[PDB]
Design a protein around this ligand. Structure first.
Ligand SMILES: O=C1[C@H](CC[C@H](O)c2ccc(F)cc2)[C@@H](c2ccc(O)cc2)N1c1ccc(F)cc1
Ligand SMILES: [Cl-]
Length: 171
């Protein structure tokens, strides 16, 4: 069930699956601190809502303060998060997060699909797996694809390394 693009986190935490979900997918103190650390500002979120089909939905908007000047100073972003009912019936959590940016060069060419899988382990532990696909909306001819990929893979590498490290402090 991993996405084939890249596997960024695959780690067993001394955190229960439900508390993992709470830390990452609610307006938790953890995500307030993490947002500050990552220079993510002006966060607006919904709660989780429940669809007739049983999946749950959550959306967010926020601004990213960017570090590479060629990507701009800031970009607005929108996220759509889906929690799959089938995963919950199987006693785990599978969330697909789709992330779109609005201001970076070539913003209209791509979006990011991040898949978060939280599986129960003995003794109030869980395994968190996070994998990512870069998805194209327009054909990224030539240097376009090279620049999108180089910038994205490096930024996400940093982001998820810090997420894993900061989650360890919540054990
Ligand atoms: O994936 C992800 C990151 C998720 C963000 C997270 O959902 C969060 C955290 C705290 C909040 F309060 C609110 C939302 C985000 C990202 C943001 C900043 C970064 O320096 C790197 C990646 N991104 C991304 C993906 C594609 C892209 F084109 C630009 C950014
Ligand atoms: Cl469960």
């Amino acid at each position: 069930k991993d996405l084939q693009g890249r596997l960024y986190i695959n780690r067993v935490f001394h955190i229960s699956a439900e508390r993992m979900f709470e830390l990452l997918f609610t307006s938790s103190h953890f995500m307030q601190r993490f947002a500050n650390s990552r220079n993510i500002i002006d966060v607006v979120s919904t709660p989780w809502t429940v669809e007739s089909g049983g999946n749950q939905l959550r959306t967010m908007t926020y601004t990213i303060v960017l570090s590479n000047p060629l990507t701009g100073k800031y970009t607005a972003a929108t996220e759509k998060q889906t929690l799959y009912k089938e995963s919950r019936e199987a006693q785990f959590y599978l969330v697909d997060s789709e992330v779109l940016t609005h201001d970076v060069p070539y913003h209209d060419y791509f979006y990011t699909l991040n898949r978060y899988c939280i599986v129960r382990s003995a003794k109030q532990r869980c395994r968190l797996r996070v994998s990512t696909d870069l998805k194209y909306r327009k054909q990224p001819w030539g240097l376009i694809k090279s620049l999108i990929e180089k910038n994205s893979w490096s930024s996400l590498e940093s982001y998820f390394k810090k997420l894993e490290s900061d989650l360890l402090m919540e054990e």
